[PDB]
Amino acid sequence: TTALVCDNGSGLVKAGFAGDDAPRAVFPSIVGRPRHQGVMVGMGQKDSYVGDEAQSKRGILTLKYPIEHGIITNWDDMEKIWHHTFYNELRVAPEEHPTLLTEAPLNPKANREKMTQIMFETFNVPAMYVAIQAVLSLYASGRTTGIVLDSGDGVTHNVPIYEGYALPHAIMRLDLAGRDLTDYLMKILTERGYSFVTTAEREIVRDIKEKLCYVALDFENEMATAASSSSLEKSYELPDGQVITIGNERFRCPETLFQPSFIGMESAGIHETTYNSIMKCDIDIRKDLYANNVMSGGTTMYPGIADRMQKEITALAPSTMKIKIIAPPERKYSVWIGGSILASLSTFQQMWITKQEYDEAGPSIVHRKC
Amino acid sequence: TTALVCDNGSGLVKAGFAGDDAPRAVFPSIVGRPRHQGVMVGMGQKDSYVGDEAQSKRGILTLKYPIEHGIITNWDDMEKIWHHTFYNELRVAPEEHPTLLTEAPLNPKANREKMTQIMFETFNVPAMYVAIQAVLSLYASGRTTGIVLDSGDGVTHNVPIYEGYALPHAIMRLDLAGRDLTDYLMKILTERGYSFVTTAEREIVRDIKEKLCYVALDFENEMATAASSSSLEKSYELPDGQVITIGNERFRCPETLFQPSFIGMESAGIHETTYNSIMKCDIDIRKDLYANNVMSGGTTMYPGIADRMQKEITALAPSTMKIKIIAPPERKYSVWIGGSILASLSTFQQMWITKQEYDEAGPSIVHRKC
Amino acid sequence: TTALVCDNGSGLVKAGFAGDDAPRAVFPSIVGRPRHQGVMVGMGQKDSYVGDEAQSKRGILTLKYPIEHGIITNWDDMEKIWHHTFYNELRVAPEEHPTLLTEAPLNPKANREKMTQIMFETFNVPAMYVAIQAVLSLYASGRTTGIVLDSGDGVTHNVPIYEGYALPHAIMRLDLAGRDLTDYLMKILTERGYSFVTTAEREIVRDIKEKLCYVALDFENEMATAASSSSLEKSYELPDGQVITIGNERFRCPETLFQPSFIGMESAGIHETTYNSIMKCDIDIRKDLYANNVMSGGTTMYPGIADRMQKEITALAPSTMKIKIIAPPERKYSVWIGGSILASLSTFQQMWITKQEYDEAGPSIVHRKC
Amino acid sequence: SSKGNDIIAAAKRMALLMAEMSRLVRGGSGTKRALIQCAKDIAKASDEVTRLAKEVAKQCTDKRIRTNLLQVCERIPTISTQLKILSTVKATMLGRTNISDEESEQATEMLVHNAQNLMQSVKETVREAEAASIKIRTDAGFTLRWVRKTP
Ligand SMILES: Nc1ncnc2c1ncn2[C@@H]1O[C@H](COP(=O)(O)OP(=O)(O)O)[C@@H](O)[C@H]1O
Ligand SMILES: Nc1ncnc2c1ncn2[C@@H]1O[C@H](COP(=O)(O)OP(=O)(O)O)[C@@H](O)[C@H]1O
Ligand SMILES: Nc1ncnc2c1ncn2[C@@H]1O[C@H](COP(=O)(O)OP(=O)(O)O)[C@@H](O)[C@H]1O
Ligand SMILES: [Mg+2]
Ligand SMILES: [Mg+2]
Ligand SMILES: [Mg+2]
């Protein structure tokens, strides 16, 4: 048989088989339910849509994400997504495949115990294991040493690793990611007269964010350039045929990662959170962490995010150090690719949590093993 | 047993059986009573005429319609038309057939409650159901998605439907239809010296409307064309034997669907009512509504109505969408044809209002089901 | 000289002088134009009516509101209302008075740049300033701390303020107010057989809304009470002399504020919008916001709106906090009264935008100050 | 496991009748009477799919599969009924004299789109029935047991 690698993100589900180089199923992690009146007989009887069919029929549905900031909040809608990615997307039975799941650090412990109970008592997997998402991004980089910055849809976290040893006192976590930049771009698009208030219109602004937004190298130079010129303007066409024009909100939306006061948060930016995680580590390993800054996740895919991170960390580093940011083109699947490496190691098959190990310890076995 | 489909419109009754391709009985929805002196013994003793009996003897009768603007105003006359379409037209017994009825949206609730009381306590049907006319026009086109323009003799209404879901906040209704065009054509025929005043002469101007009237593509071109030449002139022969000649009133009569201010109404045209009902819908379903503009009813049977509708909505659309008006040649019976589709569905037979259910809830059961 | 305070609402204009206790001029924000034929020589040649004279001659006029949803859409008609409220209503010259204007939050920035240009280049005021409407509703309550709920004719917005500091990430805005309840009441009056379609008939249903409507404390009990009893019925006399009778639509029209699904919106009610705006704020200031719930504007004037807001927020609050809704009897003018407090402050006199500052920086100076 | 692979062959007979109907729309006015006969048996071939996709729902014990399968298969008794009645209406409208070249041009698109909508509704019940075969197979034995690899 073959191990399954499921990466349940806050915004996307990346599932597939252990050993491959790309996930087989990549679909949104939403559940849509209809909100209008089904006047035609026979057609309107489906109660909920899950994967890409909730995204195509989204004009008549209420879209809900079951995961907010890495924490599963809707446990009934989460089982619909897990039943969809097994039977409808991968088309495998879960009884014949061990499943590798992921999680962010500094989550509640009831989140990791309930997804262990659901996997063993609803889908009846033979074995399972929960891993940390920033450890798996280091497997997908050709490295055993470096500090990972993983920014997805709900969580941004830093993990320093030196020669396979993590330093858990220096692990940072910041609840600001791609869902909070979509909500901020919706707020500053009202300054031009565009109003997106529906949850189906939130999926439209997420498409404007992924195509027209970038990270400015100097924020105050671009704010003065956009006021004097009109070369920073771009156009996007809505699903009904209307054309909107944004020129200033292209770089003001991902500046919230570097200035989180734009949404009323007191936290420091992702350049200062990284530097504070290095300076919490020991002085003899700091030189090998400055030269290995692995960026992972989907929110690290803006144009200019890695040249801005190099400019801001060099201004904090002691100026004889060599700053280098590793940002591969497959950043969006680093947690999946390194998760398929880990499930393929011959050493790893003594580290699964089997089902008969689960019967004497209950769901508390996932804390003593993972 | 076979279900009955009865489409009580404001001008015509379309009755038949569930499953056929055309209504069996189509007759005017009038009731005529004599207005003269019955000097010959034995002959002149009938007191009321209903179907084509009143359309044939109309020279000695006063014709009256029990339905205006989609609302039944005379309830003693509407029982005569229902008794005529059962025993004399279809020649069936109403106790052995469930009857499907239709109604316009945004109608009074006392209109729907009284027509279940007449059907259950005077004609004693085993079951019944009241359907919306613009939903049944979508069944008769092979679609489950599109905005319907139903325009008959009293009501013009728009209903948007996407994948079997109606959006009832975007449903429009305009009380301007083929009877308000007959009354306007009677008024502008006084400019040529033709006086039609009685209710029997109203049925003659309805034949001039159905034969010589069309919709101009641009109203201001043909208003100068008809003053330059006499090529738009046409002749009609009255039942007396006289010949009238109309040249300018051919396109000025159906123009008041697009400019309702010709009869003193503040409402917008049928092209702006269609566009405003699309713009009340959600932005993701607007593209599939522009491409499916189903036209229904007998007032949409003018020569040139569908090319004028394509010109006017394209001028309001955002110029990237494609507009398409579906106007089949069976437009006059699309409410009936879709009504015979619905009563033939095996899913529909759990949706009837049986007489056992009516005895427990009274006439308020028709609002919970239909 | 005395400063002018003009509160341009979506439905009503409230103008007056800074320092007083009530606005001097309160008139509808409409512009009426004739739709019929002026057959008598000399009389019918006025082409536009503005204030209360468009409301009195409304039977021969087409009424237009130049502001919907808080945004000025007709700029030729908006200068007619400003020229009416200066010369004809207040009887002052605009060159000798600085003018305080208001605006809703999250509004387009071209709306505030154009109304600065109209004041400085058409009416030639010496100075001006634009203030947020919910900040002015806190001045008029004797408080410096509390979350404001302002609901007028186009916009319903929440603003939290603690000791004079606003939290702009927690400011809400919902485009549902008293004009969207007039249209919904017009739609559910068709169930009783009453049809109001004209824009002049829209002003009649607005008087029915302001006189017979109230907010039910428990909605599902009143929906069962009105079906069993007949004590909830009331009568209203139309200007023609007819009498209508509504019993169920009295509490179903203002329930759209608490269930916005009734008009096809996905948003939450004003009790959940208020609670979500409190929970976006910091935990140390949440106790002083539960105890100060300031209601403002004309849509908060239903009988029972404040006892219903207390029941619904208490069901969401953590049950050891005390909820107190402050709803003064002068709620309709609290944005004006707080605007006359602010324009009378000696601290404020250095915060006007003078006309010489406008010539140096153009219309973009209104964002650097207000 | 014998009525699980019956659905694929039943839904592949409809794929041949759709491709047969797609060839008849290129020809002129002579081949449109065979177009209506090609639409009156797609609606009958779709009745075979809903006859035995109900039988798979009586076999599956997982309630999230057996209720998701019946919610998607009930469109096929609806679009088939309005395809065999719309074909009867178009079979009568050709009996008129001198209709147009454009009137009958758009009358076939009301039968093609009604049949493309039926074919797109029957491929989405094969997907929820192929997901039912995974649950039927493991509850009747046929399960590969996983064993942990020894170092
Ligand atoms: N090209 C892009 N530019 C900016 N943001 C992007 C881009 N592509 C995806 N995103 C964002 O990435 C997020 C999802 O990335 P991912 O790491 O897969 O999330 P998760 O780990 O939560 O599943 C979304 O918020 C999406 O908007
Ligand atoms: N060819 C035609 N051109 C214009 N109007 C027509 C034509 N045929 C019928 N009408 C009008 O259609 C109306 C009746 O259409 P129909 O929709 O069947 O009636 P109902 O009001 O009962 O739904 C009448 O007012 C009649 O004048
Ligand atoms: N007593 C009342 N009950 C309910 N609604 C009212 C009442 N008085 C006024 N309104 C509504 O208040 C709205 C205007 O309120 P107001 O705040 O003065 O307007 P704006 O803020 O738009 O200038 C109108 O839509 C009107 O119908
Ligand atoms: Mg992730
Ligand atoms: Mg009709
Ligand atoms: Mg106001």
Residue numbers in the entry:
A (entry chain C), B (entry chain E), C (entry chain D): 5 to 374
D (entry chain M): 981 to 1131
The authors write:
As optimizing the density of fully-decorated, well-separated individual filaments in cryo-EM images is a major bottleneck for single-particle analysis of F-actin-ABP complexes, we chose to use the ABD of the vinculin splice variant metavinculin for these studies, where a 68 amino-acid insert displaces the H1 helix and replaces it with helix H1’, producing a protein which retains actin binding but completely loses actin bundling activity. Previous studies have suggested these isoforms engage an essentially identical site on the F-actin surface with equivalent affinity, and we further found the metavinculin ABD lacks force-activated actin-binding activity in our TIRF assay, validating its use in these studies. Consistent with our previous medium-resolution structural studies, we find the metavinculin ABD undergoes substantial conformational remodeling upon F-actin engagement, characterized by displacement of helix H1’ from the 5-helix bundle to license a rearrangement of helices H2–H5 to relieve clashes with F-actin. N-terminal residues 879–980 are not visible in the map (transparent brown), and are presumably disordered in the actin-bound state, while residues 981–985 (brown) undergo a slight rearrangement, extending helix H2 by 1.5 turns (five residues). The CTE is released from its pre-bound position, extending helix H5 by two turns (six residues), then undergoing an approximately 60° swing to engage a site along actin subdomain one proximal to H5. Metavinculin H5 extension is facilitated by binding interactions with Actin I, notably a hydrophobic interaction between metavinculin I1114 and Actin Y91, and a salt bridge between metavinculin R1117 and actin E100.
Our studies focus on the homologous adhesion proteins α-catenin and vinculin, which are major ABP components found in adherens junctions (α-catenin and vinculin) and focal adhesions (vinculin) that are critical for the force-dependent strengthening of cellular adhesion and mechanotransduction. Approximately 3 Å resolution cryo-EM structures of both proteins bound to F-actin (to our knowledge, the highest-resolution structures of ABP-F-actin complexes reported to date) reveal they share an overlapping major actin-binding site. Next, we compared the metavinculin ABD-F-actin and α-catenin ABD-F-actin structures, confirming previous low- and moderate-resolution studies that both ABDs engage a major site spanning the longitudinal interface of 2 actin protomers, which we term Actin I and Actin II (numbered from the plus end of the filament).
